[PDB]
Amino acid sequence: RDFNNLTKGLCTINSWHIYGKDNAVRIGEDSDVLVTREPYVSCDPDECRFYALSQGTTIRGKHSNGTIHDRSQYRALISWPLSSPPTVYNSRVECIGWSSTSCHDGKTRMSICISGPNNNASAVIWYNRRPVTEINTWARNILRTQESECVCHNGVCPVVFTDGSATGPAETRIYYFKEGKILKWEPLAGTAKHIEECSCYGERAEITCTCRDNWQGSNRPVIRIDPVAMTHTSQYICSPVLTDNPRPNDPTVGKCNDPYPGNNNNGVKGFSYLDGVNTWLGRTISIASRSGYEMLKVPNALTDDKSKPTQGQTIVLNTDWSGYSGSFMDYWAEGECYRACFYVELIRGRPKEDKVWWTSNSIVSMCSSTEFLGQWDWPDGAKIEYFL
Amino acid sequence: RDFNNLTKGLCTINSWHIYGKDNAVRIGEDSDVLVTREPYVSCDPDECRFYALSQGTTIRGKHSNGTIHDRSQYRALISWPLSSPPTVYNSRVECIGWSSTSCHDGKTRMSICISGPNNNASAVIWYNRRPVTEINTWARNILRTQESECVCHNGVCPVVFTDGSATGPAETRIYYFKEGKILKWEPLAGTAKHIEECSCYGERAEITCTCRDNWQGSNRPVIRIDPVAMTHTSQYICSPVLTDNPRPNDPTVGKCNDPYPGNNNNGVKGFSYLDGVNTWLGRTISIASRSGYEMLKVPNALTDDKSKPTQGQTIVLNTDWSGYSGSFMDYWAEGECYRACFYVELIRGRPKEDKVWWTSNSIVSMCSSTEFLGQWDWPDGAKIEYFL
Amino acid sequence: RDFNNLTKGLCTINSWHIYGKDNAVRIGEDSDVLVTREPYVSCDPDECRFYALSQGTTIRGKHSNGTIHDRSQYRALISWPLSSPPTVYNSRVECIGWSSTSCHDGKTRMSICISGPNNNASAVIWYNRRPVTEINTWARNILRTQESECVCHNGVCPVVFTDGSATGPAETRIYYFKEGKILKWEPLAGTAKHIEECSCYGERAEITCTCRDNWQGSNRPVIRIDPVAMTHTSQYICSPVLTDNPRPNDPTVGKCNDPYPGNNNNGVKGFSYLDGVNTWLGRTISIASRSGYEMLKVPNALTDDKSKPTQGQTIVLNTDWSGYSGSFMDYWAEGECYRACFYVELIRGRPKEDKVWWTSNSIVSMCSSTEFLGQWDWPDGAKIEYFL
Amino acid sequence: RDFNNLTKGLCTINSWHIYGKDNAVRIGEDSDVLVTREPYVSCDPDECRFYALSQGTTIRGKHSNGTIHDRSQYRALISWPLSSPPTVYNSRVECIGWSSTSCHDGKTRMSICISGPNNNASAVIWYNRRPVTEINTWARNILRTQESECVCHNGVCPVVFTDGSATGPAETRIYYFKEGKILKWEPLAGTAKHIEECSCYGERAEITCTCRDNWQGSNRPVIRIDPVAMTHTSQYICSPVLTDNPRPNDPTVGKCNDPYPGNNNNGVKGFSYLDGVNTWLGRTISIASRSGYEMLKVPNALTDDKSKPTQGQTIVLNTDWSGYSGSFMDYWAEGECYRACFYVELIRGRPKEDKVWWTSNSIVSMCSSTEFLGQWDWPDGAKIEYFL
Ligand SMILES: *[C@@H]1O[C@H](CO)[C@@H](O[C@@H]2O[C@H](CO)[C@@H](O[C@@H]3O[C@H](CO[C@H]4O[C@H](CO)[C@@H](O)[C@H](O[C@H]5O[C@H](CO)[C@@H](O)[C@H](O)[C@@H]5O)[C@@H]4O)[C@@H](O)[C@H](O[C@H]4O[C@H](CO)[C@@H](O)[C@H](O)[C@@H]4O[C@H]4O[C@H](CO)[C@@H](O)[C@H](O)[C@@H]4O[C@H]4O[C@H](CO)[C@@H](O)[C@H](O)[C@@H]4O)[C@@H]3O)[C@H](O)[C@H]2NC(C)=O)[C@H](O)[C@H]1NC(C)=O
Ligand SMILES: *[C@@H]1O[C@H](CO)[C@@H](O[C@@H]2O[C@H](CO)[C@@H](O[C@@H]3O[C@H](CO[C@H]4O[C@H](CO)[C@@H](O)[C@H](O[C@H]5O[C@H](CO)[C@@H](O)[C@H](O)[C@@H]5O)[C@@H]4O)[C@@H](O)[C@H](O[C@H]4O[C@H](CO)[C@@H](O)[C@H](O)[C@@H]4O[C@H]4O[C@H](CO)[C@@H](O)[C@H](O)[C@@H]4O[C@H]4O[C@H](CO)[C@@H](O)[C@H](O)[C@@H]4O)[C@@H]3O)[C@H](O)[C@H]2NC(C)=O)[C@H](O)[C@H]1NC(C)=O
Ligand SMILES: *[C@@H]1O[C@H](CO)[C@@H](O[C@@H]2O[C@H](CO)[C@@H](O[C@@H]3O[C@H](CO[C@H]4O[C@H](CO)[C@@H](O)[C@H](O[C@H]5O[C@H](CO)[C@@H](O)[C@H](O)[C@@H]5O)[C@@H]4O)[C@@H](O)[C@H](O[C@H]4O[C@H](CO)[C@@H](O)[C@H](O)[C@@H]4O[C@H]4O[C@H](CO)[C@@H](O)[C@H](O)[C@@H]4O[C@H]4O[C@H](CO)[C@@H](O)[C@H](O)[C@@H]4O)[C@@H]3O)[C@H](O)[C@H]2NC(C)=O)[C@H](O)[C@H]1NC(C)=O
Ligand SMILES: *[C@@H]1O[C@H](CO)[C@@H](O[C@@H]2O[C@H](CO)[C@@H](O[C@@H]3O[C@H](CO[C@H]4O[C@H](CO)[C@@H](O)[C@H](O[C@H]5O[C@H](CO)[C@@H](O)[C@H](O)[C@@H]5O)[C@@H]4O)[C@@H](O)[C@H](O[C@H]4O[C@H](CO)[C@@H](O)[C@H](O)[C@@H]4O[C@H]4O[C@H](CO)[C@@H](O)[C@H](O)[C@@H]4O[C@H]4O[C@H](CO)[C@@H](O)[C@H](O)[C@@H]4O)[C@@H]3O)[C@H](O)[C@H]2NC(C)=O)[C@H](O)[C@H]1NC(C)=O
Ligand SMILES: CC(=O)N[C@@H]1[C@@H](O)[C@@H](F)[C@](F)(C(=O)O)O[C@H]1C[C@H](O)CO
Ligand SMILES: CC(=O)N[C@@H]1[C@@H](O)[C@@H](F)[C@](F)(C(=O)O)O[C@H]1C[C@H](O)CO
Ligand SMILES: CC(=O)N[C@@H]1[C@@H](O)[C@@H](F)[C@](F)(C(=O)O)O[C@H]1C[C@H](O)CO
Ligand SMILES: CC(=O)N[C@@H]1[C@@H](O)[C@@H](F)[C@](F)(C(=O)O)O[C@H]1C[C@H](O)CO
Ligand SMILES: CC(=O)N[C@@H]1[C@@H](O)[C@@H](F)C(C(=O)O)=[O+][C@H]1C[C@H](O)CO
Ligand SMILES: [Ca+2]
Ligand SMILES: [Ca+2]
Ligand SMILES: [Ca+2]
Ligand SMILES: [Ca+2]
Structure with missing residues (x-):
């Protein structure tokens, strides 16, 4: 009925509790589960759902052969009920x-999908399940966006896109959408040198995105966006x-700019x-590959170049595969503060498990508790050998 | 709540963006997907859906053997959520x-299915999911209709039917329905010499249908219908x-009449x-078979017997199968103009791929953009060899 | 909102048009379709659905072995969307x-299921999807009811039950329900000598049931019920x-009493x-087995012991299996009269096709037209050999 | 709209009628049915549903191997429509x-799931499908709760938890929730010496739970809770x-305290x-294993240490497997009294049927009748040999 406004601060995060888990690859061993990757979670006012890019085949289907590839005509943004598998x-x-x-x-949902060959991609912006706006590639090199939920404030939903090199300077733009229409866009500013795949959350009228500098950075770039002034x-x-x-x-001192x-x-x-x-902060436990996942409490990490962990939680053991992770919150929960949440994509198959011809994932997701809860680990749980 | 009125003109078409794609044959390789053909798309005020004629069997089912045949007791008009497969x-x-x-x-949906043997077919007109009117064959030779959506204006939904020869003069009639009841019908007039399978769209209180002259014409007949006067x-x-x-x-000069x-x-x-x-204009790229699909901007094509393309877009490469194509629009989108859309049926199996015993299709669909968007091609994507 | 009242007469029946067909056995060859028998159709004010007794297994499942048996703990009344299969x-x-x-x-739906061993069966009467009333066996010999829809007038929904011998005198009772509660019951009266499986319909405040005299009769008993006076x-x-x-x-003269x-x-x-x-009148074409199905117009059949057909329609050829058939109408359609409808169960498998270990059916259903429509035939369409 | 209040007494129980049965293992032999255990039933004001702990795999799936284990990261509370299987x-x-x-x-549903390793488990309390409260293990030994529905009165929903030994003194707590928040908790009082898995029901503003003394008791402990005073x-x-x-x-005299x-x-x-x-009272017929199930009318069983059966009903024969059983009622049915209901889990597979590598169950459920209804028995019905 009204546009949501980011009027709360974050709840105190003293641990993480289990939120959702779909066990997709375990179940998909013998049921009609779509191959996916690049999952995330996003809430409507009455429902939170799982999202991912389908590969337009089931995992047991012969067409799963080749699903290591990222970009094909057979992919789509799909959503499905929380903790069910994407069937x-x-x-x-x-x-x-x-x-x-x-x-x-x-009031309603905006969804954005980019498709096309590498040199001629375009974004279609859907709002209330109708296409409204289209945006053509500006740098003719794999126009691409967040792979996790955007955030809105009073109708204004900024979105980060990047077009250009994955291994050198690229052109990153912030679009400010309202009802699916472009109110404004800006080129990337500040000191981040490369931006991909921003993970965003909103509190007290400000949107914070933690992104991936694919080119040089092992620290993560951060974009902070003012959705009223539409500046970042x-x-x-x-x-x-x-x-x-x-x-x-890890060093003893990081870099801010x-x-x-x-x-x-x-x-x-x-x-x-x-x-x-x-x-x-979230990260993989391995410095080498997408294995393990932990949360570390790092006071003033954004601003303190010597900050180290004061607390932590294991999410996935370093003997289990992880993958993409990102932020979402239920902006429509009751209560005085927003409860931080996140998901971790648990990638199975290629390239690490190459006895199968497919790549897929399942999802685990947690939200913060003000309790100091006991930890478990949350692996995908499938036995690759069953798929041989 | 009120009958829709065609009060807008067409938006400017500067390119086509991807709208929906179900990848049915790829997914159907290992999931319970119905065999179909003759698909289309149609919108309700709150939802757009895929439509097709089922063959009353799955693609992996043994009963898919023989589904090259067009007319059996096991067929039905089915619909399903946009870009999902028909399961x-x-x-x-x-x-x-x-x-x-x-x-x-x-206010609600009218749907029309014709069934029967060739010499004794009948149409049943359903309105608000109840049968309301029935129409018996008038020429005792495969009573048949559009295989894509009709269009309504103030309650009046004209529909084109043909009964009679596929290879000689036939009897084409335009019925004007309202709430499923016959207000009026007329025999075909004007200079079109044979009519099948009209693809229709509505703008500024007028309905335009592009059809198939099966008998002699490689140019397409066009019916223009006034749904207030109920004349065409x-x-x-x-x-x-x-x-x-x-x-x-292609020649240098076409024929108008x-x-x-x-x-x-x-x-x-x-x-x-x-x-x-x-x-x-849409067409197959091949002059010989249903291969490839392109859109060509041809200014004043309807009225100019020497008009040639000023722009174009590839939809399906000439090394991929196409099939039936047709028009629909979301008459209930917001905005000042109606956005042209279309689908292409991507036929797989017989008769061209005769190592399988079945015929089926999947669907791709696009809508117009006022941007000049980059093009991709959109094949079915299934590997027939997986089905051997 | 209000109880329905039978305030209309029957529409003129000049032919039968196709209404629904689920092709269950064809589709069930390779998808998760439940084994059923004893199907029927029944309308709510907003939706008409298929109904049947499930056997609590799929047709391809190993537990379909033995489903010739009528009465087990694994059966249930199920319903499903019109013309879909019971999956x-x-x-x-x-x-x-x-x-x-x-x-x-x-206002809402009453449903009645009988379960139990032969000598100790009981009916549970559900109303608004809650159990309300229970009725114990009175003759300790397979308490049983209509296997097709009941009819209501101003809240009063009579139902015919029989308990006792299938091959001799039995005890038939008519219960008058309202909101799932027993207003009254009566023992069978009039000259019908044995009653099973009444097929009922309602017009002008009167309910007519055509039933099965299993003991001696090849003509069908008829019960006429006044649901205001609650007498029959x-x-x-x-x-x-x-x-x-x-x-x-067929003779030249039948018997009334x-x-x-x-x-x-x-x-x-x-x-x-x-x-x-x-x-x-509906009947099987064969006098020997459940093969074929036709509709015959027989003026004054109820009251004229020499009435013969003046018109007819083939539904199922005598070279195709039929089975149970029964009546329903959409009491909530718009218009001045009620449109007669019926279904025919198309039984496949045992005992006639004993190369499979199962018995199941699919459904075909038609409603009357005031047109003289062309006829087709409507077989199940499955190839038993595919199931070998 | 308003909180439910326990304002009715129990209806007179003269027998039990069949309520729901899903036949899950029979159907699961050839369809995508999840492996479960620990099922139950619970009503909303508009719908009653089946509940169980999924094992995050199908029964035919290779991951069903090992599902004898109770506690893994792949389990979840799932619900599904009454008498359908958990697919x-x-x-x-x-x-x-x-x-x-x-x-x-x-007004809405509270659901509670406990997860974690044995020494560090936590409960998450969901209300209106959002997490609201979290409770950490207090005794570091398998925090665990009812495995059947809780009961609410005026918003207050008490829940029994136990943390600590299964074979010695443990710490049992009663939490009083409202809108998912903790109003109060108390340590177990009275003379019950060990508590697990309380089965609860509510009448005349009082909640009665029958539980499992795992340590020493073959009689069952009972907790009676006052949800207004929040004492027990x-x-x-x-x-x-x-x-x-x-x-x-069975002896001739039992023990009260x-x-x-x-x-x-x-x-x-x-x-x-x-x-x-x-x-x-419900019990297994066997004193040795979970075989058979009967209901016994035992007047004043709670308070009379010599009470013996005056009536009974067989639910499951002693030649069929049973399992967990528990109480629920439809608190929102119409009428003057609450109708007692229960379910029995019918466990199949390990450890008793060890030719399969899995453990699963199906469900049967009954409610009371004021009639003296004939009895049947209600086994799972699956043939284990089909799964070999
Ligand atoms: C039941 O559940 C409980 C709740 O989960 C669980 O208790 C939790 O236990 C976990 C696992 O131990 C704790 O997480 C750790 O937290 C460490 C920080 O806390 C320490 O340091 C603080 C600051 O000086 C102290 O305040 C703090 O003391 C207080 O709390 C204690 C409770 O544990 C209590 O006993 C104390 O007396 C006191 O009150 C405490 O001393 C955190 O540092 C640690 O993370 C590091 O270690 C992990 C390896 O285990 C790494 O995976 C992780 O990445 C961090 O180390 C790496 O990075 C650091 C920063 O750069 C480097 O310095 C390190 O060298 C190391 O770097 C290497 O590895 C990297 C990762 O691979 C790599 O990138 C680098 O390049 C390099 O190779 C961990 O998060 C958690 O906080 C506890 N939670 C609570 C509430 O207590 C309990 O154990 C369970 N109970 C049972 C019975 O099972
Ligand atoms: C990224 O995305 C971009 C957007 O899609 C893409 O750019 C697009 O490129 C496509 C593919 O080239 C363009 O489509 C073509 O458009 C042609 C018409 O445009 C020409 O002619 C105009 C009129 O004279 C000129 O105005 C126009 O110039 C302007 O635009 C230029 C941009 O391309 C720019 O460079 C110019 O300087 C200027 O500003 C331009 O010159 C259109 O004619 C063509 O269709 C024909 O060709 C296809 C074969 O490629 C056939 O499949 C098609 O059927 C048409 O040819 C057939 O039919 C004609 C009519 O009868 C016959 O004359 C021909 O002989 C031929 O007939 C044979 O074949 C038939 C089909 O099989 C058969 O039936 C016959 O019997 C006979 O055998 C095509 O549609 C598109 O317009 C571009 N869009 C835009 C906005 O630019 C870009 O390339 C991608 N970028 C990258 C980096 O990949
Ligand atoms: C396109 O679609 C059209 C619409 O469906 C279709 O036309 C229809 O054609 C069917 C099939 O022929 C017609 O059904 C038949 O109707 C017969 C009754 O109509 C006749 O009798 C009337 C009364 O005297 C005449 O008024 C009537 O004449 C009028 O209409 C004509 C149109 O056909 C027109 O040409 C005339 O000039 C005139 O205006 C007409 O003469 C009906 O009797 C018949 O049923 C019997 O026959 C079937 C065998 O074919 C049996 O299966 C059925 O059971 C009936 O016969 C059995 O039972 C009788 C009663 O006891 C016995 O007397 C018989 O001996 C026989 O009994 C044996 O068999 C039993 C069943 O197995 C068994 O139980 C017994 O023991 C015994 O063994 C049939 O229903 C239909 O009415 C037409 N509809 C319309 C509107 O015209 C048209 O053909 C299709 N067009 C094309 C091009 O394909
Ligand atoms: C059609 O449907 C009808 C409705 O279901 C069905 O009739 C029902 O029949 C069942 C099965 O017989 C009845 O259930 C039994 O009820 C027994 C109690 O009723 C008796 O005792 C009363 C008190 O003295 C009498 O009032 C009562 O008489 C009245 O009713 C009669 C109707 O049957 C009528 O004929 C009379 O004239 C009169 O009006 C009647 O005499 C109940 O005791 C019995 O349970 C015990 O027996 C079962 C074995 O069959 C055990 O499984 C069960 O556990 C109970 O025995 C065990 O426990 C007792 C208590 O400790 C011990 O004393 C026993 O020794 C025994 O203990 C051993 O076994 C235990 C379990 O394994 C073990 O733990 C122990 O350690 C030890 O090893 C049973 O519930 C039902 O009440 C009838 N219902 C009605 C309304 O009539 C009818 O038969 C069906 N009709 C057809 C045609 O099929
Ligand atoms: C899931 C897994 O086995 N992760 C291990 C980790 O347990 C660990 F052994 C590791 F060496 C690592 O990268 O930390 O290697 C991973 C595999 C490797 O980095 C890429 O092949
Ligand atoms: C899909 C496909 O291979 N189309 C080719 C086109 O690539 C092309 F090679 C063609 F010759 C054509 O018709 O244009 O032949 C088609 C096949 C043929 O016309 C019928 O067999
Ligand atoms: C479906 C079918 O084949 N019906 C034929 C009918 O075509 C016919 F040949 C018949 F002889 C008949 O009963 O009319 O026999 C049926 C089979 C028989 O009555 C029982 O086995
Ligand atoms: C289902 C079943 O066979 N139950 C029988 C009962 O029929 C019965 F024979 C019994 F001896 C019993 O425990 O009562 O043994 C059960 C199996 C045993 O207790 C554990 O293996
Ligand atoms: C939490 C848990 O492990 N519950 C299992 C249950 O899954 C189930 F497996 C079970 C059982 O079947 O007996 O026992 C309980 C634990 C007992 O109550 C002893 O404390
Ligand atoms: Ca990097
Ligand atoms: Ca032609
Ligand atoms: Ca008979
Ligand atoms: Ca015990």
């Missing part, structure tokens, strides 16, 4: 394409607790919640 | 039969850019949007 | 048991056009519409 | 974990009709309805 029979298609974002503004800035997380992957070993060097041309989508002493 | 578990049956049309008048006329697209299939090579010769007794359902300089 | 994933369970009826009174009478169809199965050949002899201890559920000159 | 495509996930309860307070007491069922399993043979000895360190979840002369 053929219960998945709703939001739009067609191989890069996406989606968010509800309090960017920097890196200052902390020596480095949160991309792959990455070098430049990429922390050591790994070039690679990375993973990730997120953080940056809120003074209430600051938690 | 056993998510397909809604509209009515029983082997030829159909369907359209929403703003017909002619052919004047343009030398010939849009049936199979067809001869007669079939353009060169191919007899064959054709394919197709469509155009005819709007002065804003005129786009 | 595991789309079938709604109404209640548990192996004999049923169901009807909507304009019974007789047989007088016509020599005999409509049970198996049966002797006694069973027409020639076949003992056997029969099939069937129906008629008895409305003066507007009278149509 | 991949129709099961709704309530929350993630391996121990649960759920109840509707008249506990004792055992006094009756010599002993209702745990395994158990010694102590465990009846004979079996240590084992038991099964069960229930009773304790209402003076209207008192019925």
